[PDB]
Amino acid sequence: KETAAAKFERQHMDSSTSAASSSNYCNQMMKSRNLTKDRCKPVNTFVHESLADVQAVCSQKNVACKNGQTNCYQSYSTMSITDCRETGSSKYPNCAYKTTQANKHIIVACEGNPYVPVHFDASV
């Protein structure tokens, strides 16, 4: 019922803040966005740029995705992003995350009409 584009927004967009300011950002946000409902999602990146800037990546540098498809794009510039990764102790339903704020290029897979991000592949 969620489109792929809408699910990308829910999982990855956080324009409301310019950077993670606390080490408990990931714990908060993974919970807020319902990424810990059934399982602790193991890895997830939040992007702190406008939706327009993130959609624009679908017109930038074409690269291969980790899976070998060729519909991925790398941002020409770096973006403010927060990297969330589940700690080794974390056990559902007590999900726990390490937060890393960074300025990196993003790589997204793009699909559809309009041609928009539907998968976060990596940061660089």
Curated annotation (Swiss-Prot):
Mutagenesis / variant outcome for changing residue 119 to A: Loss of activity
One GO-annotated biological process of the protein: defense response to Gram-positive bacterium
Resulting phenotype, residue 12 to A: Loss of activity
Tissue: Pancreas.
Disulfide pattern: 26-84, 40-95, 58-110, 65-72
Principal localisation: secreted
Localisation per UniProt entry: Secreted
Positions with a binding annotation for substrate: 7, 10, 41-45, 66, 85
Residues that carry a glycan: 1, 7, 34, 37, 41
Catalytic-site annotation from UniProt: 12, 119
Molecular function terms, GO-annotated: lyase activity; nucleic acid binding; ribonuclease A activity; RNA nuclease activity
The reaction(s) this protein catalyses: an [RNA] containing cytidine + H2O = an [RNA]-3'-cytidine-3'-phosphate + a 5'-hydroxy-ribonucleotide-3'-[RNA]; an [RNA] containing uridine + H2O = an [RNA]-3'-uridine-3'-phosphate + a 5'-hydroxy-ribonucleotide-3'-[RNA]
TM region positions: none
Keyword Nuclease: yes
Enzyme Commission number(s): 4.6.1.18
This protein's UniProt keywords: Disulfide bond, Endonuclease, Glycation, Glycoprotein, Hydrolase, Lyase, Nuclease, Secreted, Signal
Gene Ontology CC annotation, any one: extracellular region
Enzyme class: lyase
Subunit structure: Interacts with and forms tight 1:1 complexes with RNH1. Dimerization of two such complexes may occur. Interaction with RNH1 inhibits this protein. Monomer.
Functional note: Endonuclease that catalyzes the cleavage of RNA on the 3' side of pyrimidine nucleotides. Acts on single-stranded and double-stranded RNA.
Similarity comment: family membership: Belongs to the pancreatic ribonuclease family.
Name of the featured protein: Ribonuclease pancreatic
Origin species: Bos taurus (Bovine)
Taxonomic classification: Eukaryota, Metazoa, Chordata, Craniata, Vertebrata
Gene: RNASE1
Part of the whole protein covered: 27 to 150 of 150
